[PDB]
Ligand binder design. Structure first.
Ligand SMILES: O=C1O[C@H]([C@@H](O)CO)C(O)=C1O
Ligand SMILES: O=C1O[C@H]([C@@H](O)CO)C(O)=C1O
Ligand code: NA
Length: 163
């Protein structure tokens, strides 16, 4: 009775094992999942859009109902362009929860069709974020346990080509 299409928006800078778990859980519950990678013009991602899309496709491309798209502008305009049923967000901590509550209500005011659904991480990924991973990698820590092997290699090639 109409295919469901959920957008999963994020910087994915880089994708972690926690994002992989979330997308895999979502792909079991909706007909289509869009991994929506916010380009970040007036922000400053460590990995380019192309690197972030490739790392995501390497980790999640084996899931046949998952698409990978870069976007910018208002999430609600992307939501309407994509004809989404909902946006999906992971909730890791309390400040995540308060911020996401506020955004969902603001977006519902911009577009009354907007919907947001939330997943909580399995406890083995609950302490992982892209920001903390970037920090351990930058200080030459081993991030192998928190991210796909392709991301581990991308941090070496970020190093080698600079860093
Ligand atoms: O894709 C993202 O990286 C961070 C981080 O929380 C992941 O744990 C986040 O929320 C994104 O949008
Ligand atoms: O070799 C691998 O390990 C990573 C990660 O899943 C473990 O942190 C990954 O994607 C592989 O395929
Ligand atoms: Na999880």
């Amino acid at each position: 009775m109409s295919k469901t299409r959920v957008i999963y928006p994020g910087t994915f800078d880089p994708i972690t094992n926690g994002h992989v778990d979330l997308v895999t859980r979502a792909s079991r519950m909706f007909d289509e999942v869009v991994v929506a990678i916010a380009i970040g013009h007036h922000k400053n991602p460590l990995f380019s859009l192309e690197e972030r899309v490739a790392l995501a496709q390497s980790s999640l491309g084996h899931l046949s109902n998952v698409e990978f798209v870069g976007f910018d502008g208002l999430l609600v305009n992307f939501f309407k362009e994509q004809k989404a049923t909902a946006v999906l967000r992971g909730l890791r901590a309390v400040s995540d929860f308060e911020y996401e509550f506020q955004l969902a209500n603001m977006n519902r005011q911009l577009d009354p069709h907007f919907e947001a659904v939330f997943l909580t991480p399995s406890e083995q990924y609950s302490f992982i974020s892209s920001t903390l991973i970037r920090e351990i990698a930058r200080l030459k820590g081993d991030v192998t346990k928190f991210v796909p092997q392709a991301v581990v290699e991308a941090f070496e090639r970020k190093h080698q080509q600079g860093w």
